């Protein structure tokens, strides 16, 4: 089985910039094929037989390469080009795909908007207490969340989730849920989430008291 390694795994670019993504095969193949995928939809054939543009693919794109080394080049990127691109070989069986190169949009830095939410009355009735923190609309994507209960750091019981880049404003969001039993939750007074992001030297701190 031919292994396809794509580089980079992930990158960002501003519209107008040249973008080159590469696919390296473990053994030589006659042709490379490329597919575009956007979240929530199927892959679309993008380039076939190394260098042929599929119908509808704009001229900005160019496929090239030979042997074990192939490339997909965007001469001048457009915002609509933000997607994951997969290479694929069909030089024998199994057909294989590279791991994808995710092309994201470069934008200005943005501080997270942080919001903390107590457990709802209805959840408490069930014997549960989820405290939720949203870290919304920040750039770039790296962020840390810390939970504190009565001022003391809480690790364990934390469910973290990260969005893909927002198609509107090009930012990232994160949700963090601390789940306790109702009994533990009522044992404590203050609940705090702290976001650390490169936009500030000091954490953004939102809290509530029971």
């Amino acid at each position: 089985q031919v292994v396809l390694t794509q580089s980079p795994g992930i990158m960002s670019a501003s519209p107008g910039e040249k973008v080159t993504i590469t696919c390296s095969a473990s053994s030589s193949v006659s042709y490379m094929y490329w597919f575009q995928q956007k979240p929530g939809t199927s892959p679309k054939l993008w380039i076939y037989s190394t260098s042929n543009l599929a119908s509808g693919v704009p001229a900005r794109f160019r496929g090239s390469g030979s042997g074990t080394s192939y490339s997909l080049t965007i001469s001048r990127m457009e915002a609509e080009d933000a997607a994951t691109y997969y290479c694929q070989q069909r030089s024998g069986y199994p057909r294989t795909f590279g791991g994808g190169t995710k092309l994201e949009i470069k934008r200005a830095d943005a501080a997270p908007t942080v919001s903390i939410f107590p457990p709802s009355s209805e959840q408490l009735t069930s014997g549960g207490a989820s405290v939720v923190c949203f870290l919304n609309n920040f750039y770039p994507k790296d962020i840390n969340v810390k939970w504190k209960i009565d001022g003391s750091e809480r690790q364990n019981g934390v469910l973290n989730s990260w969005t893909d880049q927002d198609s509107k404003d090009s930012t990232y969001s994160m949700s963090s849920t601390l789940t306790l039993t109702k009994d533990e939750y009522e044992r404590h007074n203050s609940y705090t989430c702290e976001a650390t992001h490169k936009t500030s030297t000091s954490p953004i701190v939102k809290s509530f008291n029971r």
């Binding site: 089985q1 094929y33 597919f35 939809t41 199927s42 892959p43 679309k44 054939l45 076939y48 599929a54 997969y86 694929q88 069909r90 069986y93 199994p94 057909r95 294989t96 795909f97 791991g99 994808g100 908007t113 919001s115 939410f117 107590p118 457990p119 709802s120 009355s121 209805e122 959840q123 069930s126 549960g128 989820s130 939720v132 949203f134 919304n136 469910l159 973290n160 989730s161 990260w162 969005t163 927002d166 509107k168 969001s173 994160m174 949700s175 849920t177």
Partner: protein, 209 residues
């Protein structure tokens, strides 16, 4: 135009079987090689099976991971391709695409979930505190997917729906919405949660504490 209409997906326990069907139209099916491709976070895109055209003897190849367990077939008179999946494992979970004319055409995909976990409707909880952020917590459901909208989709901007996370054999997801703080609670904000697998359709108003 070309349509590849997949069906037969869903939830099955390990060791179980599923049969996927793909009804094709808009191209000469008898000339087309057809393929199944699956997608998961862990393994990305994986070719599953190929079945060639009549002139190419309907020759069949499988990924080694499915050899002996999956059977691809086609019915040219019904312009349809099939994938019989036996002895299912957890790692067979993913979106299965029908692919036509050697990867030129792709279906929308059908989700196949292989787990011992039973179908469970979500518990939907409101998250209440110049803009105000609100939310809903969609907890303890299985299988995927859930859809979340706000005010029946009319609140389309300001919205982040976070990928679900599987813990304790149950998924949990959250969604946030931002509205002008002057408008809440005076104007009602409602999250609408649908979980087709359990035929769940619920509207949760966000009420102040």
């Amino acid at each position: 135009e070309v349509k590849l209409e997949e069906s037969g997906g869903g939830l099955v326990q390990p060791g179980g079987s599923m049969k996927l069907s793909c009804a094709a139209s808009g191209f000469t099916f008898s000339d087309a090689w057809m393929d199944w491709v699956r997608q998961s976070p862990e393994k990305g895109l994986e070719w599953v099976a190929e079945i060639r055209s009549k002139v190419n003897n309907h020759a069949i190849h499988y990924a080694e991971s499915v050899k002996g367990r999956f059977t691809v077939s086609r019915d040219d008179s019904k312009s349809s391709v099939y994938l019989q999946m036996n002895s299912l494992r957890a790692e067979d979970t993913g979106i299965y695409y029908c692919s036509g004319w050697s990867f030129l055409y792709w279906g929308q995909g059908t989700l196949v979930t292989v787990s011992a976990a039973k179908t469970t409707p979500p518990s939907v909880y409101p998250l209440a505190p110049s803009m105000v952020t609100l939310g809903c917590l969609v907890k303890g459901y299985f299988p995927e997917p859930v859809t979340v909208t706000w005010n029946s989709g009319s609140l389309s901007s300001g919205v982040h729906t976070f990928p679900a996370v599987l813990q304790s054999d149950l998924y949990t997801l959250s969604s946030s919405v931002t509205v002008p703080s002057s408008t809440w609670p005076s104007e009602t904000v409602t999250c609408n949660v649908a979980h087709p697998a359990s035929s769940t359709k619920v509207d949760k108003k966000i009420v102040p504490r």
